[PDB]
Structures are given as C-alpha cells and as structure tokens.
Paper text:
Each subunit is composed of two functional domains: helices α1, α5, and α6 form the dimerization domain, and helices α3 and α4 form a helix-turn-helix (HTH) DNA-binding domain.
Rv2887 binds both SA and PAS in the same cavity surrounded by helices α1, α2, α3, and α5 from one protomer and helix α1 from the other protomer. Residue Arg42 of Rv2887 forms two hydrogen bonds with the carboxylic acid groups of SA and PAS, and residue Asp114 interacts with their hydroxyl groups via a water molecule bridge. Residues Leu20, Val24, Leu35, Phe38 and Val39 of one protomer interact with the phenol group of SA/PAS by van der Waals interactions, and residue Gly10 of the other protomer stacks to the phenol group plane. The distances between the Gln64 Cα and Gln64′ Cα atoms are 13.6 Å, 14.6 Å and 15.4 Å in the apo, SA-bound and PAS-bound forms, respectively.
Numbering used by the authors:
A (entry chain B): 3 to 137
B (entry chain A): 1 to 137
Write the structure that this text describes.
C-alpha cells in the first residue's frame, strides 16, 4: 500500500535525522555515538551489559565490546578492585570519563536542540512530554 | 529521577521503540511474520531492489540477518528475484501478488498495534504527535 507510514518507520526517520547530527556534534570531542551511549549509560547503571549498550547504540555487541575496550584503554572506564572478591566491580566511569561524559552530554543536548528547532518551543516541550508518556 | 533524568532525544526515542517492538511482533505472529520480515516487506513494497544493508538498518538488524530474512521471504513466495528474461542478471527484489496480499494483512495488524501503543495519548495528541514526527524526519 502506497500510503502506509507505521509508527516505527516515523521513529526510524527521526533517528536518521538525529544520529548524524549527534555524531557531528560529538566529533570535536573525539567521541562516536556508541562511545557516548556507553559513557552516559555506564554513568547511570554501572556494569550494564554490553548487549543492552549495543541495543541502545544501534551496534553489534562485538562493536560495543570494542567501544568498551577503547574507553577502558583510554582511562575513561575502569573496573575497580572489589577488595572482597576475586572479580571486579561493575564497569564504572573514572574521573577522566565522568568529566568527558559531562562535556559530551552538553554537546548532545545542544545537538538535540538543533534537531528539535523545527518545532516551536511549546511544541518541543509537548513533544518531549508525549515521548516520555509513550516510553 | 532515574534513568530518564536529562534524557537525550535518542534515548527517549529508543524507549518508545522498546514499547512498540514487542507489540508489533506479537501482532505479526499470527501471520507467520517477524518484525524484520515485515520491515522488509513494506520497504520492498515501496522501494524495489533495496540493498540488504539499508533494509537491515531500517529493521535494526545485521545485514546477515536481513539476508536470511530475504531468503525466508523468497522461499515463502512473497519476494521474487526472477531471472532476467534475456540477459543473465537477476532482477531486483520485488513483491509478488502473494507478498502484496501478505503485506496488506501485516500492515493492518501493525496499524492496530500502533494504535495500542498510541492509546496512552489522547486522540488530538495522537494527531499532533505523528505530525511532529513527520516534521522531525
Ligand atoms: O515499519 C517499520 O519500518 C517499523 C520499524 C520498527 C518498528 C516497527 C515498524 O513498523
Ligand atoms: O543517548 C542515547 O542513548 C542516544 C541514542 C541514540 C542517539 C542519540 C543518543 O543520545
């Protein structure tokens, strides 16, 4: 049928507008979108599985694991001691990574503002309320 | 408070998608379709011969999985790649009559599933919301 736009398709197109602008906004900080996903979500949920991080970042779990290894090698994500056990604590942000995540969150906030700029301010607030009500 | 604190737009969009996908899949199940197969059907119904990569991106799946979906729909008589009648090439993937009828039923149930996800906004909020989605995309 020629006149079919399902909700999932509309969401995907908003995403297709959004992801390149978020990437371009993150580029001056040396970050990709999956790295920002990893940083912020790890700042909210320590040790969150690579599978869910990959699901959120629209990447394969292998690619998200490479993201994790790079952020760990760069000193942004640490798995600390856990002096009681033989295994480490859930993956967590360092001071390096938390300052990094704060700047990335500023830049991503601005990028979302530029994507939302095709609506009026009340339309933007109402649209965000609808998104929160749907999710 | 919680995970939604200072939630970026991509995270909120992902949350709506996370509500929507199980309901769409459950709605598609009685027709023998998965979500990736339906995405493939609809997109092929409007754009013949679309690369497996783009179909996979739209279905949020790997290109390998989308190639399996393609074999699946072709084996089921919904998607044909017929031989070129006088060259030797293979024609772009398009829907057959059976694939078009299949897509008509699938789009009916998917529309209903979207209605159930949208039921958490009022009807005017539904119209507003979909127009806003259209302007954002
Ligand atoms: O039609 C789509 O492209 C789609 C995508 C994701 C979820 C549900 C959908 O109908
Ligand atoms: O923060 C996210 O989870 C996100 C996901 C996709 C695109 C942009 C984003 O900020």
């Amino acid at each position: 049928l020629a006149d079919d736009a399902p909700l999932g398709y509309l969401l995907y197109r908003v995403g297709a507008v959004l992801r390149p602008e978020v990437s371009a906004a993150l580029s001056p900080l040396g970050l990709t979108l999956p790295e920002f996903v990893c940083l912020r979500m790890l700042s909210q949920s320590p040790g969150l599985s690579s599978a869910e991080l990959a699901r959120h970042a629209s990447v394969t779990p292998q690619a998200m694991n490479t993201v994790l290894r790079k952020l760990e090698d760069a000193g942004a994500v640490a798995r600390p001691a856990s002096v009681s056990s033989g295994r480490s604590l859930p993956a967590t942000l360092t001071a390096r990574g938390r300052a990094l995540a704060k700047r990335a969150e500023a830049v991503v906030r601005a990028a979302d503002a530029r994507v939302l700029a095709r609506l009026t301010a009340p339309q933007q607030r109402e649209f965000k309320r609808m998104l929160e009500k749907l999710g």
